[PDB]
A and B are shown apart, each in its own frame.
Chain A
Amino acid sequence: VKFPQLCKFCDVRFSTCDNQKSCMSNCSITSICEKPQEVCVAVWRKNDENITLETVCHDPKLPYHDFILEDAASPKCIMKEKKKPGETFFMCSCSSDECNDNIIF
């Protein structure tokens, strides 16, 4: 029986990572996704001088904030160039243990 995955559940948070090839999420809570089909995804927005990181399990066959993961089966999180109006939107999809905890740009 395939079991859930191990992603961080940090919700809205403030981080100081940017202009780095890779950085860690600094989250303190590794969680078991409540349903076996969820995957780890980390959203990274850089508003003016404020950078906010949120990372939770995601149901790949469903849009979170109106978007689709192109590599939901990836093992390691890679932040891709998402486009929003005046918003440095980024999102990565990984499918390993705590993979969202390590972030690579």
Chain B
Amino acid sequence: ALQCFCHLCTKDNFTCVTDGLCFVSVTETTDKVIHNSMCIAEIDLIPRDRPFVCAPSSKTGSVTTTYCCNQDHCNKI
């Protein structure tokens, strides 16, 4: 399946295999930045036409860039 970076997987060295999408979210806090790169499977994509998890999630107060890409090892921006 697809090849995405899992910023929390060490055994496979930051490489998670998914049949859904690569998920990269950058959170901008007042003193730190957190990048949650993870694999999202097909059944977790609901609705498939426009999943809410991968749907845009830009809220007020926090400059969060939710971002799902489709290529292999693309979830890095």
| A→B interface (CB under 8 Å) | 1, 3-4, 32, 34
Contact = CB atoms under 8 A, between A and B. Distances in A.
A1 B49 contact: no
Interface of A is mostly: loop
- Between A1, A4, A32, A34, the greatest number of chain B beta carbons within 10 A of the residue's beta carbon is seen for A1
B interface bracket (residues with beta carbon within 8 Å of A) = 10 to 19
A1 B68 contact: yes
13 contacts: A1-B21, A1-B54, A1-B68, A1-B69, A1-B70, A3-B50, A3-B54, A3-B55, A3-B56, A4-B50, A32-B47, A32-B50, A34-B49
Contacts of B47: 32
